[PDB]
Amino acid sequence: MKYMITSKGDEKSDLLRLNMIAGFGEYDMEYDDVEPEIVISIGGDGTFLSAFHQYEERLDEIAFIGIHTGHLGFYADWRPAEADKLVKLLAKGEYQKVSYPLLKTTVKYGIGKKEATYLALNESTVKSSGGPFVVDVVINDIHFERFRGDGLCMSTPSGTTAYNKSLGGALMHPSIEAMQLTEMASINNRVYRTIGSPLVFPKHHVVSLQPVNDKDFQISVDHLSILHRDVQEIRYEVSAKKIHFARFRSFPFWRRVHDSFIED
Amino acid sequence: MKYMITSKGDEKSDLLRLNMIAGFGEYDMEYDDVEPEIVISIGGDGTFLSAFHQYEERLDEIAFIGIHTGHLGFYADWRPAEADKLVKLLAKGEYQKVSYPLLKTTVKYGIGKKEATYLALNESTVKSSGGPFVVDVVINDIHFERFRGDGLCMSTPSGTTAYNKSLGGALMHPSIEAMQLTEMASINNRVYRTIGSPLVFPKHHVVSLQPVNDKDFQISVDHLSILHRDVQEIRYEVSAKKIHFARFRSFPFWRRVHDSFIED
Amino acid sequence: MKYMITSKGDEKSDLLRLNMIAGFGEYDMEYDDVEPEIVISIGGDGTFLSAFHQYEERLDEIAFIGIHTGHLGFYADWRPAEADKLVKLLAKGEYQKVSYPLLKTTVKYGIGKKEATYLALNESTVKSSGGPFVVDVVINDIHFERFRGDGLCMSTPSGTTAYNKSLGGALMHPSIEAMQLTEMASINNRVYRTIGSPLVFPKHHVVSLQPVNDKDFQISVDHLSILHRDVQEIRYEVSAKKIHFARFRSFPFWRRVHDSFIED
Amino acid sequence: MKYMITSKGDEKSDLLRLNMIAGFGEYDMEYDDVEPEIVISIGGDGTFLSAFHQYEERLDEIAFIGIHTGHLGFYADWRPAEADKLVKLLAKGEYQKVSYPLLKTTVKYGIGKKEATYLALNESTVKSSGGPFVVDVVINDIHFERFRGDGLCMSTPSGTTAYNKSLGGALMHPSIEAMQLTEMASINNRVYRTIGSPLVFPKHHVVSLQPVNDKDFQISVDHLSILHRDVQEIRYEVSAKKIHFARFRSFPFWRRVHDSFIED
Numbered sequence A, B, C, D: 001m002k003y004m005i006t007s008k009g010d011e012k013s014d015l016l017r018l019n020m021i022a023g024f025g026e027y028d029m030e031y032d033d034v035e036p037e038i039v040i041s042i043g044g045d046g047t048f049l050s051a052f053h054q055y056e057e058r059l060d061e062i063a064f065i066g067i068h069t070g071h072l073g074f075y076a077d078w079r080p081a082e083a084d085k086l087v088k089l090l091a092k093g094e095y096q097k098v099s100y101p102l103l104k105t106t107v108k109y110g111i112g113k114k115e116a117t118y119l120a121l122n123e124s125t126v127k128s129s130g131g132p133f134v135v136d137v138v139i140n141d142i143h144f145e146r147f148r149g150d151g152l153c154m155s156t157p158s159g160t161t162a163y164n165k166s167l168g169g170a171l172m173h174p175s176i177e178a179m180q181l182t183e184m185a186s187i188n189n190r191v192y193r194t195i196g197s198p199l200v201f202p203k204h205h206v207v208s209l210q211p212v213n214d215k216d217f218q219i220s221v222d223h224l225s226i227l228h229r230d231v232q233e234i235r236y237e238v239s240a241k242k243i244h245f246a247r248f249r250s251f252p253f254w255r256r257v258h259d260s261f262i263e264d
């Protein structure tokens, strides 16, 4: 079938990519970076994230594979020495697939700008444009808290091992369809109050951020970060779309967690 | 149908119980504390927990209701002033039910003791009998970490607002079938390593605690706490059984979280 | 003696300032905002911080007083109703003074820029200009750690109740001549390692931040925040200068902590 | 002068002790475990702590030395290979000394028990005898908070790298004469409130714990832990006594922190 390969750009990843392309030539495999059914990432998790966002409009027809040329990654979790064996089973077809949930982000503005929607594989964060960050947090049309601090982070299940982890969030198995909200240096006293604990939301729950004074926020989605003007609402919810991985052997998530944070 | 009412034992709760019993006499309602279909708790969450454990062998034929005579509780979430209105719709039958997941705990010993299983509504904790607490944490037959510290806590979703919250755990909506493991003052250095972050496990995942040197542990299940001798394994997993609540009006979990921790 | 009064700018603070000026006219008190010996701040802690930085070159000849027109502040800790009584003892002379330690910040550049030194009453923070923040932390010419994360915060003792507190730092009594370093969402795994815990340094200890790749950092000193280019080193140490307060009654720091965070 | 050596009891430490005793015989050194001026500990920090408490009534006439036969310790910070060189300079006399602050603990009872005072090198902790732990925290005769949770920990400066560190406390240089109080899984909601942050107290500040309902507490001092009955007050303050170390080369505290927690 149609496939393509993205590379980190260094000497190790480019030559591994050329080797896999040459190996794919020995099989009925067509290179196509416009409508691929198999997208292979070579480098790190950042290389995988770019590959995800390059084809986020055909997620339902693509099975991703990540190869790490450096340290082990949560998405690029196959060593370069397994590249040749990867080519065989990838061209043989007939492989099982694993799907992870994604985060949907919706940004609404005033008159002049159309509602913008984004799709995140790791997390989406909100900070202020320069002054103090103050927003009202509304959960399913119910006012929950007035947050004051550095910012907030909403994470996918597979994204919990990234920025979410550094903020005290919990690591959840990617088979749980949920999203997790964490705080960034919240100010708490007798007058200002936040929950403090991370919050885990199931499907169909809508978490809304609404400005109090400043309407400009620095919003990030994975590696992309843009300053948004005249914002009326930020809307978070578990996406109905999922990312599909090609599965060729058992690499449990908790083993991947152990290898990355305990030892390997 | 058959019903019964437990009371905290103070003057406020006993008289409210007698009032509801008198009100139930005006309807086709039989008092039975042996095979009740409706169990009403009056007092606090601790009173509700005792009512849960008193009838944990007929959870599939009982719809629980909690009434708080003091502050708002996560299980006893109905004010005493709504008692009369509660009697009407409770005796009218025809009400919807909400189910929360439970935690299954299995304790295995050597020769002489039979495997003991417990059912928790909030959480189960493990500490040492006196010396240092050291256990190996095994996730789905895979060694994950060697934990050294004060202890560990495995929480239900609805139990996340209790002891789990005090240990840095995340608050998760009770509709998510999961369990959450948190650490208690773990020692970390160059030689001893733990994950630190809380872990959220889905259904069918088995988390096992195995001793290293001492085989005596102080194991708690909700309010009950017993010293266990000659322990070979502690086994945690989401229970196949659920607790059923009688639903008479919308009291969202996140609103219950807001009223208890933000303001009311 | 010579005195001056700064105001928050709102209607409540301006009229209180005019009242105190009129009261000072009944005594031998000269208004001078060039060489004052008494600087009175009316508003909040932010108003006090501006007054501190306006006269940070004559700290050894000025006794500060803070008046809070809103909620209680750690520096503006006198209610407006005590203004008249404040005027009497302030003009009577003869009052005791309390001194708090300050933080000295030194920023070194390459060729073209002179070494810049700053004096902070609360804290100084360092973040990246846009990309990832990575610095080597050197303590008394000894390499301690390579920090990767959002940033770092070095706090004065009296500044520990501000941004330091939101980052997990400890609250220390302002009579202890020290400074406290805290982390901002540090990334930790098997390859990247930080201490995690806050660090408290005594006098004459020098903590140095040295770049790894990017040499541009967003450095803050209290409310001021400037992007610094071509930075070679950031140097932190307890300042030899102290801020002097005029003391007219016992308001213990721990009581001030209790009133602000527990209840009042 | 008079000296003595304590051993961990294993084969490595006993033989190293006999070797040092034989080496001391080549000099004017008298073995005396009743009135020694030099106390050498061989093993780990736990071996050093026992040596400290064995001679805590002659701390002003003893210079301690710690030798670690296993991993590096904060008190036993000299490798076994430096034992022979240690004997020479120890018998040569003429060495500088370093002093660390200690924590004084005072426990008061009702009629029948005399006030008991303890001296801690690391920390003192308080937990409940079985039920819930609730105490009022009084700072310099001022009520600060009502603590509810698992317990509290008051640490010396050098003790901050031990149990204090596991509870989120800050690491402070042992030259700062202070003590640090940390919380153990405190319950916080709209009705119950604690400061949360660790607190650092200078000399002459008195922190008092007073019971609310239960008067039985499990009080620990370093490795010793005793259940105290009918307790009226627990009193913490920086001790006027200090522990003296013999200094033979520069091993900075922050380097000792780096070697133990970052890498070595």
Ligand SMILES: [N-]=[N+]=NCCCn1c(Br)nc2c(N)ncnc21
Pocket: A045, A046, A049, A074, A075, A122, A158, A159, A160, A161, A162
């Ligand atoms: N070291 N490093 N890189 C910074 C982190 C990069 N990263 C990305 Br992108 N995704 C993940 C992830 N799911 N879990 C952990 N880390 C991640």
Ligand SMILES: [N-]=[N+]=NCCCn1c(Br)nc2c(N)ncnc21
Pocket: B045, B046, B049, B074, B075, B122, B158, B159, B160, B161, B162
């Ligand atoms: N104050 N107080 N009581 C101590 C806590 C009692 N508690 C029980 Br039991 N269950 C819960 C729960 N699910 N969430 C919060 N708190 C709970």
Ligand SMILES: [N-]=[N+]=NCCCn1c(Br)nc2c(N)ncnc21
Pocket: C045, C046, C049, C074, C075, C122, C158, C159, C160, C161, C162
């Ligand atoms: N609410 N509010 N204002 C944000 C915090 C303002 N602030 C300043 Br400035 N100094 C301090 C301080 N020493 N302790 C606490 N807070 C402070």
Ligand SMILES: [N-]=[N+]=NCCCn1c(Br)nc2c(N)ncnc21
Pocket: D045, D046, D049, D074, D075, D122, D158, D159, D160, D161, D162
């Ligand atoms: N691994 N291990 N042992 C458990 C900790 C033993 N320990 C003792 Br005792 N004192 C200290 C100390 N000052 N800093 C760190 N650790 C200590």
